[PDB]
Amino acid sequence: VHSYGYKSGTRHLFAKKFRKHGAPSVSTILTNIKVGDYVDVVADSAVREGMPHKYYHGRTGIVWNVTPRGVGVIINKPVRTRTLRKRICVRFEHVRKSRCQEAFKAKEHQFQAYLAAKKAGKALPPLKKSSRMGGIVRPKNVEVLARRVADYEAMVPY
Amino acid sequence: GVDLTGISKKSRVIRHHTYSTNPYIKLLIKLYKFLAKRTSSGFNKVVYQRLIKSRSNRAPISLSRIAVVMKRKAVFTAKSKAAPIAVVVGDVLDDVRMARIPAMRVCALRFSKSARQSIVAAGGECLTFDQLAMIAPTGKNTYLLRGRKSGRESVRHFGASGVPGSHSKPYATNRGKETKRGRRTGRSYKRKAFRHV
Amino acid sequence: VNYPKKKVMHCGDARCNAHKSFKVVQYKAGKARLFARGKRRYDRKQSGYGGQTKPVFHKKAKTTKKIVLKLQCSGCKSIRQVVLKRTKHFELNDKK
Amino acid sequence: AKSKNHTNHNQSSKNHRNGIKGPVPLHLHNSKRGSWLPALVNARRVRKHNQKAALKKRRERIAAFAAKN
Amino acid sequence: PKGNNAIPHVHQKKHWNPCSSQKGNVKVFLNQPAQKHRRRRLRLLKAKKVFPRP
RNA sequence: GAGUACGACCACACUUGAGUGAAAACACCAUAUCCCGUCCGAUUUGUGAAGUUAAGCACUCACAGGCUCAGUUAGUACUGAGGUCAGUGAUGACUCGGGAACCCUGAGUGCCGUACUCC
RNA sequence: GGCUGGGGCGGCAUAUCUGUUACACGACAACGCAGGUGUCCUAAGGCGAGCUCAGUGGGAACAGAAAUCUCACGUAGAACACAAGCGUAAAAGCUUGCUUGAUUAACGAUUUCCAGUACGAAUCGAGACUGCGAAAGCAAGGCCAGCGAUCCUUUGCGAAGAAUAGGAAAUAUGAACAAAUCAUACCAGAGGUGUCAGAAUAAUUACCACAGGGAUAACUGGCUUGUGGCGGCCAAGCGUUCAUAGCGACGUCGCUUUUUGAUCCUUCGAUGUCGGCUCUUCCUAACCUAGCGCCGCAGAAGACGCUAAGGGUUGGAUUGUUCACC
RNA sequence: UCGAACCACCUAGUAGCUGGUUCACAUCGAAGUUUCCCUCAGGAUAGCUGGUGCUAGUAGAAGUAUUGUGCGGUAAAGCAAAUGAUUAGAGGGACCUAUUCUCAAACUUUAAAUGUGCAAACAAACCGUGCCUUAGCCAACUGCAAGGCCGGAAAGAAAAGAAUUAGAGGCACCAAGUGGGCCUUCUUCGGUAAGCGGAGCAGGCGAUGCGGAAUGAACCGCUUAGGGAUAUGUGGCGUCAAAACUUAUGGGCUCAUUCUCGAUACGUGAAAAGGGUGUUGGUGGAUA
RNA sequence: GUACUUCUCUCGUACUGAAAGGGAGAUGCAAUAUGCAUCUGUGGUGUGCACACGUCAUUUGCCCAACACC
């Protein structure tokens, strides 16, 4: 980076992948964003206006303001001794709802559905056990490890 | 050598003793240093914590702050059982802005002359900390108060004036001196009145 | 830069309060007047002995000037001042 | 004399010496002044009516207490 | 100047300190009470001469 | 089992050369007063329905090109940590660990909704 | 003025924009690499509609490699004011139609540089009046470089009319009053600092001075060895013949510190800074002297090599010379 | 005394420059970097640091894992894939077709290791034909937005390898010194190279000795209150010199004639190409 | 020197606009270009010592200071 411009470092970060070129698909226009929701900021390059800065590409935060064509996101940018909490304004083409929170909110459902399942039983599925615990092994086939005379002429090709 | 990065950075400053030359304060801490030790009560060791704080950290509450606050608690108490004592480790002052105060049995280190009359004339008492050891040795059914520390002109000057979103009073003897750049929007710029953090 | 002699913009007054066709005239104007407060002061400082008392500017780095347009609302009477980018040659010229 | 030196050398050792303080919680500063306004207005027009209703509950719990005893 | 301190306007530039070089416009009131006892002694003596005139 | 209208993912859907297509659709088509648009009713626009599956479209096919997934390439290349390791060096092996890519082989050649309709 | 592999001269690395260095977030230096900026545009801005581009191939009076018509192919190989990158195919390109969203925008927030200050540029909004479009929608310039403090000067807004009274609504001041001028104020713009967070600026000193610097040049010494010097390896060829008696190209591997550079580690409250004379000593890559191998060594003279530094190594003309020549 | 005399005074002239700056012990303990400056031997500013603290001693904890989920174009690879270089033959002089040798910091389909953003149960999230409120959305309307209220449950986070902690979080005031750095593993640019110049991630010296490499700022071990014991690290056991009074009842290899064979990494703090029927091993082929 | 003294002076209790000028409570009713009444009172919400009544550190009450949103 010689010139320290606005979008000074990027012929790759902002390039579209090979044979993925195109303008943004419908499915990302028909997503809707509620305030408080987590989001990935990934800048699409086929929409000029509204891009996030080079730093924010690839981060996640909590949407806060929602405007007709815009959004806004709260992202943690570490600075000298501290993390400022930055508010950026993006055109939502660059925004995708994050799956980050997901496996947790699925752990919470599979607890409650578990709990209402014990309430009056029906019992419950069995608890899987460790693979690291003991056992006798009954080998179906057994072979020998050795270094072969032939193994060396394979490592000098040609 | 054992590895303890720091170790100078978990350590904090406490200062058990007092910085006051007052011979009477040195008696009051003598009482609570004793009876915050052996008493097994929360109240009674907070006032020992508070009794060594230098004047800046003990801010006077006005009267009418005790009254308003204690009228908020007196509503939800049982009508049979009432014995709250206003216990303040600072100075208690006289509020000209309020008249007709009930009778509160306030306790304090020092009373404004107009504040003490303005209590007893309305029927309450004023009882200092050598009494309250006799009335509330456990601190039982006391009501402990602090002050108001955030309106001081020193707390108002803190922070830089020209930082965006900082409303702070700069140091100048002539107030008409610094209005004219970075304050007014017209010339060079105006410091932003509000900034998200 | 060719720019129209007449431009339909907007007029701000309650009397204007719509798009009105204006009349475009360039701002190259001010004539320094004596008895302006800063000139009355520079004559009391400059007077007498001592040299030039106020810094005179020599090093001139710019070849252009921003172009201010005085636009006079036709049906409503106010003038507006609109600023444009820097250009070395500015000309008001009908449609091309 | 060549005075133009630039280094990052000791810095991230200093930046972590008081540590990098983690972010401020979501609940702490909201202060929505950004903001999309016609939603912001309709938020205060409710946030007033929640004050009346909540300050009324302050009165109904004054009576209901003294009512109890 | 360093820090948040106020912008000092103290006007001491003119020569005031009586530096071994110069003299310097310093007025000192160390004689205040001796002139307090003198203005009184001279109100009494005039009262003693003016007598019995108010 | 299909068609049409709207579609989601956007080649397992494309590209080329062949083959076959029930009904209903789709379309090609006939035409140019009127609305409309051009050098040209070609595109287009308006009227309608005599003709054909020839073409589009749907389907099947090809030791087809491409593309999808998995193998192999290969625990090789590279690489985080280590040495009072080897070597004059260039570099390399070793130790605790992560671990590729093309060619090459085999297998696949769209799928999923709403609405109306055909046997 | 400044930066500066001493200073000067040159340059601009001084404000700046794209690719790379840059090490798969971001950040990252050099007088590192390859280029840009101070402008240009009432259309090259805004929008709707129709179309498809560079090129290739078949065919058509003159007409050809190259004119215009026609068909087919055509993933962008074209274009988008310009440097570069990125992005775009019923468009962001081209043609065409209507237009002024290149205006105003209540002191909204935010990004970039960053101290999380300003400037520049940019993103997201809310209000006014609009433009194009059947409509959804699009537009506050041409995405992203194309720019400017305090003070001073200068222009624009505060039309008329009404108020029994300064209010919801009439711009304020000239301070004893009141008018009409004049001046000033509050708001938004322009005139500019290119050293670009913004001084008003030509030389010489060998007659020179001061404060300091080994933070920094002119000696030695140190590192390095390109350059100079010296040597080896391979063997195309020369030597009538025959690679190697003696040489040895194209290549290639080293050594030395008697050359010149490169650097700037030591010395600036001081290491006396060319050459000769004098005097001693050391090194060997050996000129003579001792012993020897080998030859394109018949003898004579000599070539090449080995051990070996014990001994020796001159008299002069010219030049301040070292060097050089007789 | 002269490229501006002498005397006294303004005058203790100004200096970002050189020199100096007098008692002890204790608790702590840096920086040579950022941004701006006619700025580059200096300052202001953030950072590092100390003092005073405030605040309800596990809160808004983390220079680290695991799980889930995002981001990426360096090393590698590729030219039989685009862009740019590029050798040769063949097939149907140039061409055309399919291959071929060789490449790229400013090329790329593909694409690591190390990294980086977030999340992982107490102001939160999850659940409800709950209710209230709106000048928000809509052709709906008890749907969706928001602030609440009231109920529900809460392994307080199971099982699956399924975390750990010398984890009191958080806020504030005042202020010093520093803003010439230098060295090293690895990455790394200019240079033939440099004990040269310039950076990245870190660790050190600076400021710090002590044990060790004979010696050395930085290497190796180690981290220092005043003492004793036992044990060790790096490095060592022929004498110097503590330890094999020259250990083994261990295996090989090596003879080096004047800078004298070799023998402490970092330390080219010294050696290469090329040679040797010196000696000691091995691989392949061959005659008996 | 100590002892004594006042009207005043001055820093404060209020700020804002260039200025002429203006100038701050709560609740209820209520919408009146100065609405009306009451006056023992935190403007509201989330977090938050001590205290109080419970419970197996913690439920609720009030929450002082203080932080944040209005």
TrEMBL record, chain A:
Any one Gene Ontology MF annotation carried by this entry is: structural constituent of ribosome
Which Gene Ontology BP annotations are present? translation
Pfam families named in the record = Ribosomal_L21e
Which InterPro entries does this chain map to? Answer: Ribosomal_eL21, Ribosomal_eL21_CS, Ribosomal_eL21_sf, Translation_prot_SH3-like_sf
> Domain of life here?
Eukaryota
Q: Which UniProt keywords apply?
A: Ribonucleoprotein, Ribosomal protein
Q: Name one GO cellular component term.
A: ribosome
What the record says about family reads: Belongs to the eukaryotic ribosomal protein eL21 family.
What is the recorded name of this protein?
60S ribosomal protein L21, putative
TrEMBL record, chain B:
Q: What Gene Ontology terms describe where this protein resides (cellular component)?
A: cytosolic large ribosomal subunit
GO biological-process terms attached to the record: translation
Which Pfam families does the entry mention? Ribosomal_L18 (PF17135)
Its annotated compartments are: Cytoplasm
Which keywords has UniProt assigned to this entry? Answer: Ribonucleoprotein, Ribosomal protein
User: Quick check: keyword GTP-binding in the entry?
Assistant: no
Q: Gene3D superfamilies attached here?
A: 3.100.10.10
* A molecular function GO annotation: RNA binding
Residue ranges annotated as compositionally biased, kind Basic residues, are: 178-197
Question: Where does the record place the Large ribosomal subunit protein uL15/eL18 domain?
Answer: 1-190
Which residue stretches belong to region Disordered? 156-197
Q: Which family does it belong to?
A: Belongs to the eukaryotic ribosomal protein eL18 family.
Record-linked PANTHER family: 60S RIBOSOMAL PROTEIN L18, LARGE RIBOSOMAL SUBUNIT PROTEIN EL18
From the Swiss-Prot or TrEMBL record, give the protein name: 60S ribosomal protein L18, putative
Q: Write down the species.
A: Leishmania donovani
Automatic annotation (TrEMBL), chain C:
Q: Does the keyword Ribosomal protein apply?
A: yes
Coiled-coil annotated spans: none
Q: Is this entry keyworded Ribonucleoprotein?
A: yes
In the record, biological process GO terms are: translation
Enumerate the GO terms in the molecular function aspect. Answer: structural constituent of ribosome
Of the GO CC terms on this record, one is: ribosome
Q: Where is the signal peptide?
A: none
Q: Keywords on this record? A: Ribonucleoprotein, Ribosomal protein
What are the cysteine partners in each disulfide bond?
11-16, 11-73, 11-76, 16-76, 73-76
Family, according to the entry, reads as follows: Belongs to the eukaryotic ribosomal protein eL42 family.
Task: Extract the PANTHER family matched here.
Answer: 60S RIBOSOMAL PROTEIN L36A/L44
Please report the name of this protein according to its UniProt entry: 60S ribosomal protein L44, putative
The uppermost taxa in this organism's lineage are: Eukaryota, Discoba, Euglenozoa, Kinetoplastea, Metakinetoplastina
